[model samples]
Target chain A: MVTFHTNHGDIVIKTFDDKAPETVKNXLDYCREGFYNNTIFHRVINGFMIQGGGFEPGMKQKATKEPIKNEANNGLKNTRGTLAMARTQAPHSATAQXFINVVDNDFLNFSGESLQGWGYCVFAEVVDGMDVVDKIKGVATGRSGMHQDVPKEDVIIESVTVSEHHHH
Target chain B: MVTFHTNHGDIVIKTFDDKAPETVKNXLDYCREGFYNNTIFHRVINGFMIQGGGFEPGMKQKATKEPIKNEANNGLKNTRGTLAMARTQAPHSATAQXFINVVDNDFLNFSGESLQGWGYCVFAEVVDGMDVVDKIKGVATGRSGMHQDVPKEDVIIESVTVSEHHHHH
Candidate 1:
């Protein structure tokens, strides 16, 4: 399980190691190290969700080598309590960024087998401490001048601690 | 040409891009982003190549990505001035660490068509800093608790600067 320890509270997100190896391993690699430390929740839209783990504390992006293969086809839905990998307009462009599902986002799920049908890889779900997520969700947001959807108040992620969800 | 600014002196190395794409791309990615900054020559041997690009100044191993593919069969020689990726006994375990050829270590190069014959990929060669590499290559060494061939005094690497090489040869 992966727990993102934000300034607000800790959110325990579950990983589907058997379901999504590529997506699960990628998040684990970044979080296991101190890569997610001091990164701010750059985007927080009410009813949508809070997103972080891309830009540094100073808004500088951590250089990522490349994106991992999309595992959105693994039958994992972007429903409430689930977490998904964040990607660019290109479906296969997800790397080092993820978001929790505050509400069930079916429109963001795999619809068909085409490029447009490709959806975000849902690798985890919030099993505990989602109140912290809601606390972050309640913040007022606007343009931070550096980028858009800026949280006027810095909802910084002090650090993201994670451990393997070993199965029997 | 890639210039390494060290306390000993500046050494310039050139990459053979066409011959070793995997090794060349790997070296350039780390070089351009300043991965070698403040890292020390962790291993050094007189008349042998000095090794670095692995440990920080305090002997902390840099958190590198997964090991990259080995391209030792690309036919680059292990002659002097050539730079090669360093790895363990595992043939494809090289990633971000490198060593220079102070002396012609032909035995380190790919020899026969066997797993044991696989060699370290020679991606670049020192264009002007063999003197600097040699100077650091002569440092005194002893076991420093964990690692072997460690320099008694730290031989630091300030930075490695590189630019695109458009070669016709």
Candidate 2:
């Protein structure tokens, strides 16, 4: 299990390793090493998604070691209650920036010849504090500089922790 | 209209003022000022959403002036073909980091208490280069430090510019 510390409270996320092994491993490694301890939720757009886990509270972009391979082919859809990576124009620019699906977002899946048939990989789901996710989703928002859908209040990502459990 | 230059090609996104006026204006301002030029799509996860418009190619996080308010009350859903902001846990930590929805993500909408009523706000939709988005959505990914689902390649946000239609606004 993965634990997320937010201004609201601590949230535990259950990983779907049977579905997304690589994605779960990657997120777990980060949590194991405290890579997201002080990281901020940098991007929050109401009705869209809340994004962060790379930069600090001051908008300081943290330096990343390297990125992992995309697991879109893992058979996970961009459905509701799934987790996916946030990246750039290039096929592999995702150093950080993860968001939990508050809705069913299927269009994000690969559908073009260039995509090689891979789609967004969902590694986990919110076993608890989905209400917190819901609460964060409902905050007031406005424009901040060139970015849109900026939340009016601060929704800090306190910290992220990891726990191991065995399945029968 | 906002124009952005990507390695694959140039793209134009139209903001829905009726849905998110202030959020659209904030993004437009950044586009007009070239705030997104040479910025890297710091976060990319295949099969989900591709996000960018914050850090430079070298991963230098740029400082934004201020954040816009949430417009979830505008009735815009976090459906496919929309643009939204990325912010910190702080309600106002959204300096940069915007994303385009490739799918109809209805779960992102707010539904619970006042603290969690409206979900992420949808400010705009992609008007061009959807093929590019699809292509980017198919790349291989892995983990990087505390982050997961990072792409193995380098999907960069070459530049961001606002078209003449709404450049001044």
Candidate 3:
């Protein structure tokens, strides 16, 4: 389990290690390096999801490492309170960016190995402080440059602490 | 001058050849090659602009040639009825995608050479069919994939016809 101490509040996450080994390791490596610290949840679609860990407060995008191969075919779903990898139009382009589903978004689940069907990989789920995430999702949002649904006020992730013990 | 026969109506454009020589030539080359045929105006923001020339119907993005240098410093403004190049976060990355201003978008004009200040390049203006552009801007829009303000029905450019003569200044 890992706890993300954010400006909103602390939210605990439990990873699906056995199902998405590479993705969990990638996110854990980033968490241990403190790469997500002070990064803002740039995108916040109220009923959809809140994406973060890629941009700073002023919408300045931070450089990330090479993209990771999508592990979305592991049969996990993008239900409410689940954590998933965020990516570009091309599948397997996720790198450091992640999102927490605020609602049941079944459409984002992987269907096949094709371009349009290869969906986002759900690597973790919110184990505690989901109310904090709900609060973050309700914040007012506006357009910033080419990005829409951006949180008007910054939702900063102050720090992330990883532990060896499992939640269960 | 170039005429775009679209589903809404015909929009005629007069290029700023003297100010944006390369930009105008790039668009002219695409026009002459029928590259804009059957392309759809995918992004349309009412009272802002209408962007197209990069995607076909159903939001399938078409491949583009190399990007062109931004000529926004040529003193042209992104005022109403003007045309400008659409690019990514990086300045000078425009390639084929373009937008027509429906209102005065002064914020898009070049302010400096920096990343945030480097603005969109205004390469042309509507010579005729401003009303057609106004009508196109009023189309109903919805979210498609990661893109917003997409027209519910496709606003396709049936064909583009270029001319050698310029309107008397």
Q: In order, what lDDT does every prediction score?
A: 0.78, 0.68, 0.87
Model 2 C-alpha lDDT per residue in residues A47-109, reported as the tens digit of each score: 566677776765667777567666666666665556788766554555566887776677777
Residues forming the 10-long window of minimal summed lDDT in candidate 3 chain A: A125-134
Task: Say which docking band candidate 3 falls in.
Answer: incorrect
Candidate 2: deviation at residue B105, Å?
1.0
| TM-score of each prediction | 0.48, 0.49, 0.51
Ten contiguous residues with the weakest lDDT in model 1 chain A: A159-168
Candidate 1 has which clashing residue pairs, if any?
B81-B125, B81-B126, B83-B124
lDDT of 1: 0.78
Runs in model 2 with CA error above 4 Å?
A1-168, B112-115, B165-169
Weakest ten-residue segment in model 1 chain B by summed lDDT: B160-169
Candidate 3 residue lDDT tens string, A6-69: 9898887878899899899999999998988888999998889999989988899988999889
lDDT of 2 by residue, B57-88 (tens): 55567888788777766777665567877766
Tell me, by lDDT, which candidate is best. Answer: 3
